[PDB]
Symmetry: C2
Subunit: 461 residues, 2 copies
């Protein structure tokens, strides 16, 4: 009844930091270092050191995911595992061998690889030495790392992504304390958002210098949730318009249209917090847009006016212009604190189709996190996650409406394949099609896995 | 009788490596290492370690150049003196203090500073670690170096040069054995010529990122001597055609026009030796042409067909397309092996005028070196170098005719002010207006010096 285009990709999304574990990894990223020194900041004291044991059990993990109808797996290559010397991007041989093993195994199981280069995992040594993403030198080191990935694996990987949601890096490392180093500095955050936008452009440039097949393409993964104003009142609208420019246009516009949003640049210039740019850097951004777009969506985004005037003496933050708003009568994922609003996927699809040239895009992430899933085991040891199937049904329904209106969506990737380590939340919330009992790292298909495999076979539901 | 436009600069030219000595210099450049290691390759075993003692005697040295009518002085800052760590361009405080002292002493003596950034003096450690100018990483490290010079001295230096004749670095380091490392390898030479053009464009961009006054301008110093064919047999003008593209257009076209000469790139392509270039690098070159041109001219350049076919089985060199030619009846500087042909300066002036938008340019070097000037000491120990005064009048006569056709020549710099250290030839040939007795480091003005001072006070002769 709900059907999908011929050739639609049914996939799963994870990342290296949340699956592999730190086995034999040469370098600490910022989350590795944070757990090593502040294990109390992580749920039940569970860090990334073992995660879901993908380093050791990748071949059987891929077999399980293949059973669950995963036609494409998007994951990430860790900068801190592939590279020995960050300055020259020399290679760690065992890191190279591991990713060769993973990729060949995907292929042996008929899973198309989607390879993203960075998922929140900056080497902590680059933060100590250069302050990380604030440094344009670090931006160059990143490009060197990307070059190695393309040279080593571009023979059998077609689909690439530069970053998974750079905004979460900006937000987490420099605004709200989610990511080590937990800097709280608005103006620095502005410069970091610029630098990652520039690092992405330079990575598309290097990618196409080395591309040999016409199938090879590289994208970026962004969150494009609309900023819904609380009311039609003018102050709520003004808060919405800025929240939109800041949370969406800051990255979508450079990546797809090749320039930063004029109104946002004007605003940050007025507040004296604009980034430092050179003409050459702006020319690189303008000359190397992405080939495709990955959209991550989980919950809506609503915004009302700020409590106090933005002109009050206070540290600059993007939040001086908008405040989060809770809508009465919202439909809630109560244990999780997330509103359920599948219509936003249709809003997203329409925007891409209308204002961004209907660039090729996919749902790179959509999923539901539930705690204590052992409450839903049946008498055969399988999690009856009907709530997860329902969640997928409602959101896929909204997505198909966007497609029927003509949006260029080409796939849907579940977060996630196998339950994986969710940063400070660790394993408190489960998202997978496949459960992981993490004391023994024993993995077992959930009920939704069989439904997902069957969805891919009928290409609908 | 022969007068010049108002404001014409009468100056002198040298370099850091050829004047300073290595007193308390932190790093070895390629020539320092070559001398410390093969002193037998240098005339009379005289190296750059003391040179003309400019490190110790800059103040009185400058007072004497001013007496000789040096209105502006061009010289160079040594990468190997100013920089502590090359990777970051951190500063050597004593080097910074030295160059501040030199620049401030120039202005106290009313000499305008013309500061060039590079004169054959690659740090030898950058060769050992990266192969020097073959590495685009080294190209970035030079821009870091150039940025520090701009920030440290741009407050009282208006006129800058990226390089003094990069073709001599290509030729000497990678084709004919003139410069340590003495590599003989055509393909590498092609890539080094391209990399250095790229460093200069990147330096021009950085300079205008930081320039605050409109007087501040940055140029490049090239040799633009025309390639005169031996005859008008088609084989000789084919040789003169390539010799022109290779020796002049290879650097002048990128520097001034923003692009490499297409028929050169076509032949480098057909022969399988083209440099590796990215679109971003080419756009940088197109977008940052130099502000002005420095021309070095000493002697003409004559070319005939090669002895064998360019299709013979031999390693690729540019010389497979042309062989130098000795014209019967040439006017010669016999003691030196150099033809005298002042008309060439008139040809250069016209070329720049007609084919390069008449860009502001100057003669950055012109001079005559003779050996054993002890033979022309008068009773008060003054060199009576009438041969030097004559040489200047003939070339100035030719330059003045070029200006009268309207060519935008704005100054004339003689090589050199004080006798300086001429690489492997050391002090065998002297070019200065001021003699240096190198055993005692005592400088006395030659007769040409007082003649130069009258020429500036009058703008003619």
């Amino acid at each position: 009844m709900v059907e999908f285009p011929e050739g639609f990709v049914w996939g799963a999304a994870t990342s290296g930091p949340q699956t592999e574990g730190n086995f034999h990894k040469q370098h600490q990223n910022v989350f590795d270092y944070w757990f090593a020194t502040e294990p109390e900041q992580f749920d039940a004291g569970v860090g990334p050191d073992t995660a879901s044991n993908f380093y050791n059990d990748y071949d059987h993990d891929l077999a399980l995911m293949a059973q669950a109808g995963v036609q494409g797996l998007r994951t990430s290559i860790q900068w801190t595992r592939l590279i020995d010397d960050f300055e020259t991007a020399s290679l760690n041989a065992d890191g190279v061998a591991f990713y060769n093993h993973v990729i060949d195994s995907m292929l042996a199981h008929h899973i198309t690889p989607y390879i993203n280069l960075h998922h929140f995992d900056l080497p902590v040594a680059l933060y100590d030495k250069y302050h990380g993403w604030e440094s344009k030198h670090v931006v160059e080191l990143f490009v060197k790392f990307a070059e190695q990935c393309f040279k080593l694996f571009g023979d059998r990987v077609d689909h690439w992504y530069t970053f998974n949601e750079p905004k979460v890096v900006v937000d987490g490392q420099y605004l709200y304390g989610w990511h080590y180093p937990q800097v709280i500095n608005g103006p620095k955050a502005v410069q970091v958002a610029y630098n990652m936008n520039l690092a992405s452009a330079k990575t598309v440039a290097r990618f196409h210098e080395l591309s040999v097949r016409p199938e090879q393409q590289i994208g970026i993964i962004l969150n494009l949730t609309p900023a819904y104003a609380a009311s039609d009142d003018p102050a709520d609208l003004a808060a919405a318009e800025f929240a939109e420019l800041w949370s969406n246009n800051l990255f979508l516009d450079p990546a797809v249209l090749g320039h930063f949003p004029e109104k946002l640049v004007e605003r940050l210039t007025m507040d004296g917090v604009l980034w430092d740019a050179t003409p050459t850097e702006l020319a690189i951004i303008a000359a190397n847009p992405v080939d495709s777009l990955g959209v991550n969506y989980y919950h809506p985004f609503r915004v009302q006016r700020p409590d106090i005037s933005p002109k009050s003496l206070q540290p600059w933050m993007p939040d001086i212009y908008f405040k989060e708003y809770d809508m009465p009568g919202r439909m809630m994922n109560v244990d999780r604190g997330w509103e359920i609003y599948p219509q936003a996927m249709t809003d997203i699809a329409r925007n891409i189709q209308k204002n961004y040239g209907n660039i090729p895009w996919m749902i790179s992430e959509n999923g539901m996190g539930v705690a204590g899933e052992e409450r839903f085991l049946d008498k055969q040891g399988v999690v009856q996650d009907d709530y997860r199937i329902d969640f997928m049904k409602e959101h896929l329904t909204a997505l198909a409406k966007g497609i029927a209106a003509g949006s260029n969506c080409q796939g849907y990737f579940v977060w996630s394949g196998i339950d994986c380590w969710s940063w400070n939340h660790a394993y408190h919330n489960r998202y997978g099609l496949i459960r992981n009992d993490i004391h023994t790292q024993t993995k077992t298909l959930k009920k939704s896995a069989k439904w997902f495999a069957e969805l891919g076979e009928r290409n609908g539901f």
